[PDB]
Amino acid sequence: EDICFIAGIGDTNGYGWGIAKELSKRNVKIIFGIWPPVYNIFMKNYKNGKFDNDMIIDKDKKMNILDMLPFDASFDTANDIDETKNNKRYNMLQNYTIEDVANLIHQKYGKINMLVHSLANAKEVQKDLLNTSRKGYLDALSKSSYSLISLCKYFVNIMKPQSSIISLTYHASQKVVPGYGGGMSSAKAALESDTRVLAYHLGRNYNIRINTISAGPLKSFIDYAIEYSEKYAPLRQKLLSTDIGSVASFLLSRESRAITGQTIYVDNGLNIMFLPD
Amino acid sequence: EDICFIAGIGDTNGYGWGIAKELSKRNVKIIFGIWPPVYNIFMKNYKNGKFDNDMIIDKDKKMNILDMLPFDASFDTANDIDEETKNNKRYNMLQNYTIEDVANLIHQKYGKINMLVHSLANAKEVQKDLLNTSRKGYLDALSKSSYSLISLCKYFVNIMKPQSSIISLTYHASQKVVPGYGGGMSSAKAALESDTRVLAYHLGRNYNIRINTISAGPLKSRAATAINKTFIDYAIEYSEKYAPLRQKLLSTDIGSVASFLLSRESRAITGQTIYVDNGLNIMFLPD
Ligand SMILES: NC(=O)c1ccc[n+]([C@@H]2O[C@H](COP(=O)([O-])OP(=O)(O)OC[C@H]3O[C@@H](n4cnc5c(N)ncnc54)[C@H](O)[C@@H]3O)[C@@H](O)[C@H]2O)c1
Ligand SMILES: NC(=O)c1ccc[n+]([C@@H]2O[C@H](COP(=O)([O-])OP(=O)(O)OC[C@H]3O[C@@H](n4cnc5c(N)ncnc54)[C@H](O)[C@@H]3O)[C@@H](O)[C@H]2O)c1
Ligand SMILES: O=c1oc2cc(O)ccc2cc1Oc1ccc(Cl)cc1O
Ligand SMILES: O=c1oc2cc(O)ccc2cc1Oc1ccc(Cl)cc1O
DSSP: OOOEEEEOOOSSSSSSHHHHHHHHHHTEEEEEOOOOOHHHHHHHHHHTTTTTTGGOOSSSOOEEEEEEEOOOTOSSSSGGGGGGGGGGTTOOOOOSSHHHHHHHHHHOOOOEEEEEEOOOTTTTTTTTTGHHHHHEEHHHIIIIIIHHHHHHHHHHGGGGEEEEEEEEGGGEEEEEEEETTTHHHHHHHHHHHHHHHHHHHHHHOOOEEEEEEOOOOOOOOHHHHHHHHHHSSSOOSOOOOOHHHHHHHHTTTTTGGTTOEEEEESSGGGGGGGOOO | EEEEEEOOOSSEEEEEEEHHHHHHTTTEEEEEEEHHHHHHHHHHHHTTTTTTTTEEEETTTTTTEEEHHHHOOSSSSGGOHHHHHHHTTTTTTTSOOHHHHHHHHHHHHOOOOOEEEEOOOOTTTHHHHHHOOOHHHHHHHHHIIHHHHHHHHHGGGGGGEEEEEEEEEOOGTTTOOTTOTTHHHHHHHHHHHHHHHHHHHHHHHHHOEEEEEEEEOOOOOHHHHHHHHHHHHHHHHHHHHHHSSSSSOOOHHHHHHHHHHHHHTTTTOOOOOOEEEEGGGGGOOOO
């Protein structure tokens, strides 16, 4: 049976949740990686039932969450944590680096076969690119782009061949979105290019596929993008996290065995438009 | 329960058959639109059980085919059919094979459908390089391989439900140079990819219908064999050697992607060119 690790979830309002919901329809067991400083809050809400309605799949089943672990996309191995290890919101948690999480999952449940990268972080997102600092820019690339490579590097060892990996990206990488600042656009451009390069390496070496989903806006600026999307997209339906979810589910399955290295647009077709009318 | 019209089947060796086969797996009802030059041959083969192995899905399941209809994408309506064709040895016994007539016929027999597959192409002069292609040959390719999609849409949107879905097939020669892909096929695929976007806007806004195109890798179909002056064997060997995924590309690999795009699982994807080619398109330098 199938296990998917979803790295980067903090609530039920984002892409990771909708991806988890849809995979659950196929009886995929889900492991969530949750950013350590929001990990306890998430567990609290979880235990207090807050996510119960959100976990309902259909008349018969709820989401099968196999586990929830603290996961920090900033840290490749235990050797990379600087005071931080003993910071307020870190010191009651352990084994949350990328390598530690891979070891932990493998120790508890063996090999997995689906991997979802769903994280993005830029401390200076509100600053436009031209006014972004080196530190802010590199922090964005580290958390939002390198973390994909590191994820792949450490998880391939614990995946079955014919496994499949996806990440999330955004069209600001390819066309100008004023407001998507702080190097997030740069991060997405690097993420999309790396998906190809990773596709070559993982494909030839391991028979593992990797693709990325370029999603439309979901409020998880965003008010403008959502308004503009809903007014001008070819399809005028509301974009749902589960719309991204079902596409992810397909890319993560053997149904898409011949697709790799692609950026797939799931955005009601908004990306095809030039001139709004 | 879903009905799909697949335009462009001649045998079991192409993408149309693989798409049919994968749609059947999902209990979609499939109607074949078959070019009249090959229609009788196909039916005879079918009726003599020659396709029986080919219809085997798995150890317990076989394809089920709702209907098989003569179909020629050159002709929009009956008034477009030239006398010579109308009286030709392979067409003269056939009827309701224009784009408009086949749409009417399907509607009359089965009601509204919800899935449409364009899986055809033609170019008289494919063996010539573009620079040496005649005006007539170039326009033949565009008419048959590209405009046909537009017209299929115009007539079928009236026999389709909202939230229905349309796909066609294209090839990466539209975007990057593949020298042997001549006669304006490259041009035709470029137009088809652009038209897919323009059509997605119109169909999405006015009808809530989606359209996408699948850019497939090489497959040794009858029509791919037509290309050599061999072209497809080179294409296939090259793909199997240099693609990220080094496995044989099957028609059913395209078929399960088509099935996904045609289903409501892809409701937020439209206007897109989706590559199903083991990743070959992402390569610059073949190691
Ligand atoms: N929401 C949109 O409008 C939009 C559009 C296109 C693409 N995307 C992409 O979708 C993905 C998910 O975003 P979302 O909108 O679902 O938000 P989300 O909250 O559901 O998920 C993103 C998660 O990343 C987590 N995170 C941040 N730093 C981390 C770290 N270093 N280690 C581990 N986790 C960390 C955050 O806690 C956050 O929960 C992102 O990659 C984003 O770029 C979003
Ligand atoms: N085989 C490949 O390597 C390749 C690669 C990428 C894309 N494609 C595309 O896939 C689609 C199917 O091609 P294939 O390779 O499966 O070849 P094919 O022989 O299976 O399909 C061509 C079919 O279209 C039919 N046809 C041709 N002209 C027609 C017309 N005037 N009206 C009605 N039917 C007509 C032919 O009878 C034939 O059955 C085409 O659009 C092609 O360009 C093929
Ligand atoms: O999850 C996010 O987390 C973030 C964290 C940050 O600090 C800055 C931006 C993001 C963006 C994030 O997602 C986005 C939301 C909306 C759009 Cl249109 C695109 C996105 O990439
Ligand atoms: O369907 C076709 O129909 C044709 C009809 C013609 O008259 C000439 C070429 C084709 C090619 C056709 O399909 C292809 C086959 C192989 C590749 Cl790599 C690309 C293709 O588009």
